[PDB]
Amino acid sequence: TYSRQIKQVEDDIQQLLKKINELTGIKESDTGLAPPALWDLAADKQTLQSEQPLQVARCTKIINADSEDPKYIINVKQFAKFVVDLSDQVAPTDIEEGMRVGVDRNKYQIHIPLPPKIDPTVTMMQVEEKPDVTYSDVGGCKEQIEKLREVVETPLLHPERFVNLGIEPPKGVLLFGPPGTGKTLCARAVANRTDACFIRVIGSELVQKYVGEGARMVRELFEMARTKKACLIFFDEIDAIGGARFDDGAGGDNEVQRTMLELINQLDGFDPRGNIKVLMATNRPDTLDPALMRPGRLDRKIEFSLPDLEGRTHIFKIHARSMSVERDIRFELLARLCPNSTGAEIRSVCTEAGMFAIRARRKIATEKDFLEAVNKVIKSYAKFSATPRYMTYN
Amino acid sequence: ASKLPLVTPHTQCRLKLLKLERIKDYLLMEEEFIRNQEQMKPLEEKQEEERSKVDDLRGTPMSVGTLEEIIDDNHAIVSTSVGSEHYVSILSFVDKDLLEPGCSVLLNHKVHAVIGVLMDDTDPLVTVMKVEKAPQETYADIGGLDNQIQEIKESVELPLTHPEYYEEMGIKPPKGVILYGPPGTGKTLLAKAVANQTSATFLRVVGSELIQKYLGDGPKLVRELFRVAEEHAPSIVFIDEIDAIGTKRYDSNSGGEREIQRTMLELLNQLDGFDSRGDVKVIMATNRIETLDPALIRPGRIDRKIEFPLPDEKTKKRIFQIHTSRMTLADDVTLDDLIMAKDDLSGADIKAICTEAGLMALRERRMKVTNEDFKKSKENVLYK
Amino acid sequence: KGVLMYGPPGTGKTLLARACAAQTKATFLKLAGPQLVQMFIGDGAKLVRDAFALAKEKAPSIIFIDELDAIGTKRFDSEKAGDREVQRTMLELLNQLDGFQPNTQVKVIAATNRVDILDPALLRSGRLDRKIEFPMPNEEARARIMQIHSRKMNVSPDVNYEELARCTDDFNGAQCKAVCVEAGMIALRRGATELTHEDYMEGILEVQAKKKANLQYYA
Ligand SMILES: Nc1ncnc2c1ncn2[C@@H]1O[C@H](COP(=O)(O)OP(=O)(O)OP(=O)(O)O)[C@@H](O)[C@H]1O
Ligand SMILES: Nc1ncnc2c1ncn2[C@@H]1O[C@H](COP(=O)(O)OP(=O)(O)OP(=O)(O)O)[C@@H](O)[C@H]1O
Ligand SMILES: Nc1ncnc2c1ncn2[C@@H]1O[C@H](COP(=O)(O)OP(=O)(O)O)[C@@H](O)[C@H]1O
Ligand SMILES: [Mg+2]
Ligand SMILES: [Mg+2]
Ligand SMILES: [Mg+2]
After folding, report:
1. CB atoms closer than 10 angstroms to residue A130
2. Which residues pair with A62 in a beta bridge?
3. Where is ATP annotated to bind (chain A)?
4. What is the DSSP letter of C114?
5. Could you give the residue ranges of the DSSP H alpha helices within chain A?
6. Beta-strand pair B280-286/B176-180
């Protein structure tokens, strides 16, 4: 009855929204301005207060001091070098050598020290954020979860059981097995659970264009790592960052080996990382260099094999808990049909097995739908299978 | 502007009447709380006066600077265009947010203080690798296959258009899609119809153009590539001819096969990283399926493996009917004689014979294509 | 003038350097391997002459190099490719080390594990004089290392370091150090306070890191 009368009372008030929101001022789509109500702190006071009394105080870098006198030696980006002086606002204590300081443009004197450079590509690989993977989702390798977790978090969450016993806990661990076995997914539970800085590193990100460029990124990595109290450094696919040294005739693959040796030097010897724990994860460990494989760098040596039967059944219970199923199916029969299978393959059996229910017109899959998944995923993709030259890791 | 998301109803409901009249409550009551401003304290206009007060703070010589760090108490170290960086302060019309390390900003001329931020003109590479429009016709152009069309709609189209079927099932779509067979079988031609069908942002890259001449520029191109792939929204990344990274060696690449290898390590990360990946589907195609790394072909990184066989003869005649649809076919010809000419002819062979036969008609300025055009057309196309 | 240590990388090479660094009251100066590797040209070479200028200034001073093979790669004749800039700094390490205008004020302690990579120009007789290798411990030093690292732990007198060093062959100071810490962790796993023989015996199997595969079908 009020068919148009609801429409025009809708539209005139939705338009009159705009007819007064243009009278407010949010408009004039900018090139980088604030909303016009947001800025009124610097309206009359800080316009002539944060601008007219305020300087520029261009930052510099200190070379060194000298004895008996301030008489500082400063350095800048391109220009020359000066003998400079403090301000009265700061002590000469934390004006230590090799430090960035804010410096006025006329008297050229030091105002405030600055934090050092972090080279923000090293900043970007701090994780800032955690995944949601629970250790319950990594079922089937519980003893590896325990033997890893006793190294990763137990001195961090309890630094009294090791100290009051009088032992120093290990700091290094590699994780290795076939692909798809739950190594990366296993590290996601660590980045879930832990609390300190979790700085991730993928070995194919350090390959640089210049000579020795990647080795300085290792340096800045461990420099910002030693600033923190405790830190966890993650390493992924470390075959890219080094296998070994084999150089014969013409120098081939030299550049990566220097970054690898730099990583060795930053790991052991000469007042070590202290409270910095590392965690590698690779595919084929046989390529790796033995001086890298020395304990004191890679103490724990966790293998990820295939589950025997029951870890597989547990993985069936993991990926098959949250899907519309027939009630009276059994998973042990399915686990008897997969002697050598990874958890990702089991997940693909489940996720395909639901697609069989989506094929015709069924809301919950059956046991024969699972059997339609087993022969296709296991036995029809069996040309590829991705495993057997990685069981020997070759 | 994002005022009220309740736009459900879809009939003459009184809720719709009373809710729009309660927007009329927040707007009639408070348009009578819009009248009084310049009535009581005029003192300025505030539409341009305070605006020109900002514009009289900031000078016309607006130098363009670059962020590298942030200290929260509105001062930070910013980079000049020269390189000699400063330690200037930050204003209050700077809307303290769109500020990331590396961002283009607007500084003062005198004290170089952080006046404004700058919208980024992006990079041409996104427009280079980004497909703009729909390429060609639909799946009805294909013909004869009809089985894996359900597979590609299954893994790609149906998750996009129907986000109900996986939720009533309690399941997620399969991740990776790979396409393999003999050459010229329509592997790219299917992705053409996919790029017709989808509304998602579509990217396409050849596996040959992955490789570079500098060191690490390959894996860096991978990292910024998946950066571009993620930073939009639902997206489809297509990879053509990924065997070519492993087959052909070129002397432009300074690193040998152990630079290609590290590029494969970076890509091998970018398929199955620990990071939250997002809504990025991956469709790949090759013809040498046996050459590349099986570590990339594992379920989890590529879930669906799709082979394209050679066309059988009853599908061949369909493809002839497709490529001879809109042409003035003289009745001289018999397509069944053209079927068994080659025992393993591809779909490209049919279209090549058709187009070259049209070229033979246009040599003689005719309008229809006769039988001898096909007779010497198969000699021209096939036998050389 | 010039000593070199080489051998397996777990036999203890940093350890003597940090030992003598605690012993002598001189200007100890350490170096990293790829520390003389720079993006711009000549900067690593100037970094050599500045460091040896400073060690020239401190007349009681000795210089250490860790992992010399990062810069000490043997040269090679190659067209079309091949690095040179590392061999620049290597050549001023040669000349600036020994040759024109020598001196006896600094002593050089170089540490590597592999020798065949090295250019023999630094291996001459006088650039690096005393080339010593560090072998693997025979049996007694294997008992001695675990006896040293078994100091600050609650050790019950059920231990036999001669039995332990005999059932542990083919180990180094790092692995024999690792037996002590893993044996020190198993007792915390079982909640024990002291250390018994079987904690060491189980620590052996973790340090060896064998692949478990279902083998009881022998004998
Ligand atoms: N034990 C398991 N239980 C459940 N799921 C598993 C298990 N192992 C592996 N998966 C599945 O494997 C997928 C990927 O695992 P992950 O990336 O850790 O493989 P990986 O062992 O690191 O090998 P790669 O380094 O080649 O990736 C995950 O999505 C996970 O679902
Ligand atoms: N089944 C088919 N039906 C009709 N036309 C086809 C068919 N297969 C291929 N074609 C035609 O042949 C041409 C080449 O096909 P396509 O590019 O898909 O080959 P391809 O297998 O992707 O080759 P590659 O992957 O090696 O580049 C297309 O332009 C298409 O029109
Ligand atoms: N007397 C010893 N014999 C062998 N190894 C020892 C001894 N004392 C300590 N160690 C262990 O061996 C390591 C020696 O370092 P080193 O072998 O020089 O490292 P690399 O040569 O791999 O750089 C130390 O980390 C230390 O824990
Ligand atoms: Mg992984
Ligand atoms: Mg093609
Ligand atoms: Mg050392």
Report:
1. 14
2. A74
3. 177-184
4. -
5. 3-24, 142-152, 154-157, 183-193, 213-227, 254-267, 310-319, 332-336, 343-359, 367-374, 388-391
6. parallel
Q: Which phi and psi angles does B232 have, rounded to 5°?
A: -100, -95
Beta bridge partners of B243: none
Sheet holding A276-282, edge to edge: A197-202, A231-236, A276-282, A173-176, A300-303
- Location of structure tokens 């007064």: A20
Check A355 against B174: CB less than 8 A apart: yes
Nearest Cα residue in chain C from A166 = C153
End-to-end CA distance of chain C: 59
Q: Which of C78, C172, C175 faces A250 most closely, judged by CB atoms?
A: C78
Q: Which among A1, A14, A30, A39 is the top mutation candidate for probing chain B, defined by the most B β-carbons within 10 Å of its own β-carbon? A: A39
Q: Which residues pair with B304 in a beta bridge?
A: B177
Residues 6+ apart with CB under 8 A from B281: B155, B156, B175, B177, B200, B235, B236, B237
Phi, psi angle pair for B43, to nearest 5°: 60, -10
Residues C33, A268: contact at Cβ < 8 Å?
no
* Strand ranges inside A78-149, DSSP E: 83-84, 100-103, 110-114
CA–CA gap between residue C182 and residue C165 (Å, rounded): 16
| Residues in a beta bridge with A277 | A232
Structural contact between residues A340 and A387, judged by C-beta atoms closer than 8 angstroms = yes
Those residues whose C-beta lies under 8 Å from the C-beta of residue A165, and which sit 6 or more positions away, are C153, C154, C184, C187, C188, C193
Q: In whole angstroms, what is the distance from residue A124 CA to residue A129 CA?
A: 12
Q: State whether A42 and B95 contact (CB < 8 Å).
A: no
- Measured CA distances, B87 to A377, B90, B117, C126 (Å): 60, 10, 17, 53
CA–CA separation, B107 vs A85, rounded Å? Answer: 28
Q: Using CA atoms, how far apart are residues B51 and A200, in angstroms rounded to an integer? A: 46
Q: Is A295 in Cβ contact with C178 (below 8 Å)?
A: yes
Is B124 strand, coil or helix? Answer: helix
Alpha-carbon distance B373 to B328, whole Å?
13
Give Rg (Cα) of chain C.
Answer: 23
Question: What is the DSSP annotation of A34-56?
Answer: PPTTTTGGGTTTTTTTSSSS---
- The span from the CA of C167 to the CA of C188, in Å, is 24
Residue of C nearest to A248 (CA): C117
B375 annotated ligand-binding residue: no
- The answer to whether B264 touches B245, Cβ cutoff 8 Å, is yes
Contact A180 CB / ligand 1 (< 6 Å):
yes
Longest C-alpha distance within chain C, in Å? 71
* The amino acid at C155: V
Q: How far from C150 is each of A362, C144, C171, CA to CA, in Å?
A: 66, 10, 16
> Measuring CA to CA, which residue among C74, C63, C151 is closest to residue C109?
C63
Nearest residue to C169 via CA among C204, C134, C212: C204
- Please report the beta strands in B8-134, taking only residues with DSSP state E, as ranges in sequence order: 63-67, 78-79, 104-107, 114-117
3-state secondary structure of B384: coil
Return the closest-CA partner of residue B209 out of B222, B191, B195: B222
Experimental determination technique: cryo-EM
CA of residue B299 to ligand 2 center, whole Å: 27
Q: Report CA torsion sign: C35, C37, C43, C44.
A: positive
Nearest-neighbour CA in chain A from C9: distance (Å): 6
* Chain A: partners with 3+ C-beta pairs within 8 Å: B, C
For residue A364, the one-letter residue type is: I
State the helix-helix crossing angle for A254-267 and A213-227, rounded to 10 degrees.
20
What resolution in Å is listed for this PDB structure?
Answer: 4.3
Query: Residue A109: beta bridge partners?
Result: A85
